[PDB]
Amino acid sequence: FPELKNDTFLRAAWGEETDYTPVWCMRQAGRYLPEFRETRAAQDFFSTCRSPEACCELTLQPLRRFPLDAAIIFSGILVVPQALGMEVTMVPGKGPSFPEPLREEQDLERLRDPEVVASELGYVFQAITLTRQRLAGRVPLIGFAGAPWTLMTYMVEGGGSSTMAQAKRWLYQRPQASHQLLRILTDALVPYLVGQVVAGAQALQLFESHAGHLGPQLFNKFALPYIRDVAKQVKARLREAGLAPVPMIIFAKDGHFALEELAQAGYEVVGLDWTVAPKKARECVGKTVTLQGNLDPCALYASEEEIGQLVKQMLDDFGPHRYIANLGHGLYPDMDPEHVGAFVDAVHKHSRLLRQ
Amino acid sequence: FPELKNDTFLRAAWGEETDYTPVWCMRQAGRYLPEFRETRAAQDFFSTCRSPEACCELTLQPLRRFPLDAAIIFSGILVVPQALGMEVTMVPGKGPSFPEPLREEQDLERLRDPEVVASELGYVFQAITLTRQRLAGRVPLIGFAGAPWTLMTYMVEGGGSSTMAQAKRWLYQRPQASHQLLRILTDALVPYLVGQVVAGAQALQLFESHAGHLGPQLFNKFALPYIRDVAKQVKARLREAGLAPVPMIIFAKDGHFALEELAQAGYEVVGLDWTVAPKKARECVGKTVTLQGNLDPCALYASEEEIGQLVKQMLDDFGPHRYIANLGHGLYPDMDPEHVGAFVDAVHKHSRLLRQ
Ligand SMILES: Cc1c2[nH]c(c1CCC(=O)O)Cc1[nH]c(c(CCC(=O)O)c1C)Cc1[nH]c(c(CCC(=O)O)c1C)Cc1[nH]c(c(CCC(=O)O)c1C)C2
Ligand SMILES: Cc1c2[nH]c(c1CCC(=O)O)Cc1[nH]c(c(CCC(=O)O)c1C)Cc1[nH]c(c(CCC(=O)O)c1C)Cc1[nH]c(c(CCC(=O)O)c1C)C2
């Protein structure tokens, strides 16, 4: 692959001092871009995911607009449940659905052996290799997957939920089957994530988007062990294959309660939602790990001037070291690309002022 | 197995009233789908048939496109002659061939004992069980086989024929050897069909695709007895194994002349080609059996609007009761998937209008 030119994001991830704070945005390839909608209009979502050229194009679009310090491959977290043998649809304005969710223990029998999942996800690897070549070293490319608990929620609920009542009913009433499912997911995720690195990914983010529905007791029992196992095993396999392990990011949305434990889970970077005050997060995680985040995505509805001031304040609270700027969650479809631009420029401008 | 969610097809097959008319299409897994061609490009046809995952994928593809009321397992009718010990090929754009057809009585000696055939077809059972699990109760799964006479034609002719002159020359010149062959086929088919149900099939269709080459006299002598024996024996074996018998469909293409006899042959459903007027078929078969069919497959070359009107007329002629919609024969490779979609949507739309 082409040599990396701007490695600021990786240096920050590993905890090195940098000349400025690197920034990227969750869902930077997203509907808020008119060009994203145009490219997507051609296929259904999961078909787009299976076209390496379409994924590469969608990955590159935000970088043509903004000097983001990382690209993230266009894909979905739900490709893993799909590769395990569940049927998923992207519903006309209602989002992802599994019309046949897992509801009893016997339903686990219809899943693939997790050791075959990576082969089913070759298309993601193809997209990654293509995008890495086309980026030509501009910035690092981030690969990603959903975390075991969050993937379980989709598989059991059959889509989004305000309570996760069915998935939590599994944890309390079916603890053994729940552990079985979470282990299947873990065993699928590890080879998938390794394959993403083999294909060219230079960092990995694990999205535990549904962390917040669990308290600490359930999180520690059912989410945390598998978060830890993913990191441990991915790093092991990469080292054994003669490759360099990449920085890994754990993002537990609404996971305020788990920050101390997440800081000791084998990830270089802990990503934060906007509800956690940066200084409190720093106290929780300590001084080695890098923090990522955490601007309220809705802050981008504010004026460009206001966005710059909110960014200044955020950067003051995080301080210059061990920090990668991002939003607290992904961009929303009605946001103005110029305000995303304002966010990026502000992190760059203020982080430099903050150093000298 | 997962509990069946949409059982409309089975209710219709047994002759129960339903809220709408269920529909499926012969060759719904077929070349008209670009994704079918892609999946097939990897192997030769009979090798694809021997991969449970490939068969499951091909079975599911049409359901991802259209709300069909049944799935049919991807396989071939020629797996039975192959399992009996004949060598078959799928010729580069010339279709199935047996380079060493049966031509004299002594040639029967090279066939397996029909009681071992089911064991040779384990791969079909594996595909069925996998597909049943993966479908997760969305719709019922149909298993199938060729009828004895039609299988004989392939075995003697060595492929397709416009006249079946060699196979008919067997019936007239070699009646005893012909009965011997038809009995071998019957004795192979029964355990195969039972095994398909044991593996998860929820209905069975027997394809007498080559019925039309026979008149009534030859059909009644050489085809009908074995059609009857298949149904009787399959139901007996299932009951004796403690399983529930499934609805069975007999489809005699070009079999206008045999409809009265087919209605008394022990099948819940008589399938019709497009040449038989629905009202005349209803008169022939009487009021218990369910009819299946019968739109000219070539009608799908017409505009989506025209397809809807032809469907409306067809449904008017059949009436709402004791009817499963399908084409009169399988989809052709040059047909437009959107027109197949139009067919499905039209049956659903008009059948509901026809009830209330
Ligand atoms: C990383 C990523 C994701 N989605 C997409 C990407 C592409 C990478 C690029 O982001 O910029 C494209 C991606 N994926 C999807 C879309 C929108 C569909 C469309 O384009 O019409 C896009 C752009 C579909 C999708 N897929 C998902 C949802 C949310 C459902 C819910 O609210 O519960 C949705 C809406 C599941 C999903 N997908 C993702 C998450 C994690 C979000 C986070 O925690 O920050 C989740 C939970 C992550
Ligand atoms: C049920 C079924 C069949 N074929 C195939 C299936 C898979 C199930 C899914 O249909 O949708 C795949 C199936 N089987 C075959 C194909 C095409 C080969 C390819 O994919 O290149 C497919 C998709 C090969 C095949 N196999 C056969 C033919 C026809 C030969 C002739 O015209 O005499 C052909 C072309 C024999 C056959 N096969 C079948 C019949 C009955 C057709 C009917 O009466 O409606 C017959 C007569 C039935």
Q: What is the molecular shape of chain A?
A: globular
Biggest interface found: A-B, 9 and 10 residues
The sequence of SSEs of chain A as H and E is HHHHEHEEHHEHHHEHEHEHEHEH
CATH topology of chain A: TIM Barrel
Structural category of chain A: alpha/beta
Q: How helix-rich are the residues of chain A, as a percent range?
A: 40-55%
Biggest beta sheet summary of chain A:
7 strands, parallel
Question: Helix count of chain A, per DSSP?
Answer: 15
Radius of gyration of chain A: 19 Å
Q: What is the subunit arrangement here?
A: homodimer
PDB class: lyase
Keywords: uroporphyrinogen decarboxylase coproporphyrinogen, X-ray crystallography, lyase
Assembly: dimeric
Entry title: Uroporphyrinogen Decarboxylase single mutant D86G in complex with coproporphyrinogen-I
Describe the model:
Two copies of one chain form a homodimer. Chain A is built from 15 helices and nine strands. Chain A is α/β, with parallel strands linked by helices and 356 residues long. In chain A, strands 1-4-5-6-7-8-9 form a seven-stranded parallel β-sheet, sandwiched between helices. In chain A, strands 2-3 form a two-stranded antiparallel sheet. Chain A starts with 7 loop residues before the first helix and ends with a helix. The interface between A and B is small, with 9 and 10 residues. The complex binds coproporphyrinogen I (1CP) (2 copies). The site of one coproporphyrinogen I has 24 residues of chain A, from strand 3.
